[PDB]
Design a protein around this nucleic acid. Structure first.
Ligand code: SF4
Ligand code: NA
Length: 214
DNA sequence: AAGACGGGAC
DNA sequence: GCCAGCT
């Protein structure tokens, strides 16, 4: 594992490759963000944006979603994949907003997790992006990056990764940091073929060196 | 707690 | 013919 100073180093380095890193899910309000992320599970942001482009014009409120039969909503998000559970989740999710959350989107991370299709990662993205509540959402790109660079053990839970990062990054930079990591991994340290050869972090990256040899 | 859910880049 | 998080 890397020292805290080296992880701070690494992050700072990522903050130079991606100064304007941000959430790529296109949204206009917390409600649209929430649906977007839910639709995100095991799916590219690019594709989600492609679909919500039209989806968010037909549906704009929790009442709009629960007004149509499951079938319809399913076809509206057919391209996404996992559209059955997602369609059922969204409708139930919208019902809850109405029944227990005064028709709005709750700003409490744990509360969000009560929503179907909304896990910790999803809940963290929402509080942080929509509500400014510092939080580190650990997703495929954050987990991989953390593990290859040695931010943590190759065997830690996403939760352990989250706690690890929280211990390091100042509360004030969790969100932005998280975003830079996503970018660093989505666009550089890519799962399929990482750009190790030109990686500013190859010098302290066990995964890079290992990949360079092989 | 493994398994089930279901367009794009090689 | 691997990559993008509830029961
Ligand atoms: S060296 Fe390679 S594997 Fe390590 S962070 Fe850079 S691109 Fe990722
Ligand atoms: Na949930």
């Amino acid at each position: 594992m890397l020292t805290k100073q080296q992880i701070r180093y690494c992050l700072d380095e990522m903050a130079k490759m991606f100064p304007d890193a941000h959430c790529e899910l296109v949204h206009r309000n917390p409600f649209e963000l929430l649906i977007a992320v839910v639709l995100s599970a095991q799916c590219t942001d690019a594709l989600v944006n492609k679909v919500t482009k039209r989806l968010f014009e037909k549906y704009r409120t929790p009442h709009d979603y629960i007004a149509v039969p499951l079938e319809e909503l399913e076809q509206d998000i057919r391209s996404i994949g996992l559209y059955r559970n997602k369609a059922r989740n969204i409708q139930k999710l919208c019902a809850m907003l109405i029944d227990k959350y005064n028709g709005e989107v709750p700003r409490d991370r744990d509360e969000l997790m009560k929503l179907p299709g909304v896990g910790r990662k999803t809940a963290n993205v929402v509080v942080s992006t929509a509500f400014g509540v510092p939080a580190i959402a650990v997703d495929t790109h954050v987990e991989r990056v953390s593990k290859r660079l040695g931010f943590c053990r190759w065997d830690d839970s996403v939760l352990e990764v989250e706690k690890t990062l929280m211990k390091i990054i100042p509360k004030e930079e969790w969100s932005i940091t998280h975003h830079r990591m996503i970018f660093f991994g989505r666009y550089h340290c890519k799962a399929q073929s990482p750009q190790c050869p030109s990686c500013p972090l190859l010098h302290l990256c066990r995964e890079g060196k290992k990949r360079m040899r092989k």
